[model samples]
Target: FDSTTFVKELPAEEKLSIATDYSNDYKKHKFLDLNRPLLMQILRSDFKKDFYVDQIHRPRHYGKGSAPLFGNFLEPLTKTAWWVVPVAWLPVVVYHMGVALKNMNQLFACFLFCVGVFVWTLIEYGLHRFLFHFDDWLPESNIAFATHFLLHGCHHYLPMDKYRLVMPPTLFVILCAPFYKLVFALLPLYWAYAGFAGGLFGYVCYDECHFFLHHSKLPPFMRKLKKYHLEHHYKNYQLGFGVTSWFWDEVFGTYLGPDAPLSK
Candidate 1:
C-alpha cells in the first residue's frame, strides 16, 4: 500500500517529471517484449515507485487500436470483448442453479446461491486489493513482472482500451478451477453447485460492471460506483480497490472518498 503522506508530499510537477523521465527511458526499447531477457532488463532498469505512479496516470493505446501483448497470431488471444462474459459464463451459472434447485431444498439452495454472490464481492475486493496490486511484494524476476503485466498492469496502462476490459474465457476457467474443486470438496453435490452458480453470477456482474465503469453511461445509482472505480485508475491505485462496491474498501481502510487528496 502507498503511504498517503508520502504520496501527498510529492508535488504534481515532480510526478510529471518522473513520468516523463521513465516514459522516455521506456521508449528506448521500442518494442514491448515479454521474453525473459528483455523483461529482466526493463524490470531492473525501470521498476520503481515513479514508474508505477507514472504508468497508472498515463494511459496509452497501440497503433492497431488494440494493444498486442504477444504479437502476431497470439495477440488476439490476449483481448476479449465485454459481451464475452455473459455469453460464455451465464449458461454455466444457469446450469448449476438449475441443478441445485432440482436436487436440493429450494429455499436452502437459494440461500446458498445468495451466499455465493456475497462471498464473490469479498473475493473481488481481495483479488484487486491484494493480488492485482501485489506490486510491493512482487519478486524481482522477469516472469513475475511479466505475469503481473499480463494479469492486471496492462489494464492500468491502457485503462480505456475497450478490447481488453473483460477477462478472457480461458483465463477465467483456469482461475475458477481451484474454487470449483474446493466448493465440491466441502459441500454436498447440489449444494456446492448452488453456491458456485451464485459466485459465477457475481463474477459475471463484476466483469460487466467493470467494462461499464470504463465505457458506459451508468444508471444514477451506479454513477457513484463508476466514479469510485475510475478513481482507482486515475487518482490512486493504492486505494479504492473495490469495484462492485466500496464496502470492502471501507472495511479495510483503503477507501478513497471524493475529498481524498489526489495521489498515486
Candidate 2:
C-alpha cells in the first residue's frame, strides 16, 4: 500500500466520531466496514488518522484507562506487572550464563555474552521500529488489525496503564522460541547459551526500562532517554522508536532530538 495516501489531516470532530465508533464496537463499525478491504475501510473512514489522534493526542485521558480486548475471563492475561519481566526471565538467563561459564573459556564466554547484550540493543530498536510500528505494512484484515492492537497498539492507546506496560510471561515464552533456535543454529552449544543469556538479559532491561520510562522518575542521566521514549508516545509515533536508548534511532535517522516539541 502507498502509505502516503493514508496520511491525512483529520479534524477534531471527525476524530471524535471515529473514536466513538471504535470505542462502541471496533469489530463491527460503520467506519470499519467488514465487507470492504481493510485498506479501503481505513481510507474511507480515516481510521488510521483517527486512531492515532484519539490515542496519542489525548494520552492523559486514555493512557490512564483500559478495557479488555477479549472476554472478561481472559482480561488478567492481558495485563502484566513491570516486575514480571525480571522475575520470570532472570532465572533462565542466569541458568544459561552459568552453564556457558562452566563449560567454556571464562573470557570467551563473557565476551560472547556481552556481544549478545549489544545485539539485543539493535533488536530492541528493530522490533520497536519495524514490528511494533507495522501499521503501514500490516495485512489488510480485521484479524490482523485486532492482533496488532492486542500486541502493541493497546500500549499506545493506554500509555500509562501500569499493569499493561510490560509483556506477559506466556507471550514472551512463545516469542523466545524462534530466537532460541536461531542462536543455537548459528553457534556451538555453550556459545549459543552464553549469547542467549545476554540477549535475554538485554530484553529484561528493555522491558523494565520501557515500563520505567512511562511511569517512574529517572536519574538525571536517564531523564533524556525517558523524554525521548515519551515523545514517541505523545509527540510523534513515527520517530523515536528506541526504548532503552536512542542509539539505534540515531543510526536509523528516526531519532527525535531532545529539542523536539510535543504535539497538541
The best candidate by lDDT is 1
List ranges where model 2 is wrong by over 4 Å. 1-66, 258-264
Candidate 1 per-residue lDDT, tens place, 102-138, comes to: 8889999999999999999999988887888887686
Q: Give all candidates' CA lDDT scores.
A: 0.73, 0.68
lDDT of 2 at 120: 94
* Candidate 1 lDDT: 0.73
Question: Which residue pairs of candidate 2 clash?
Answer: none
Off by over 4 Å in 1: 1-57
Q: TM-scores of the models, in the given order?
A: 0.82, 0.77
RMSD of each: 5.9, 7.5
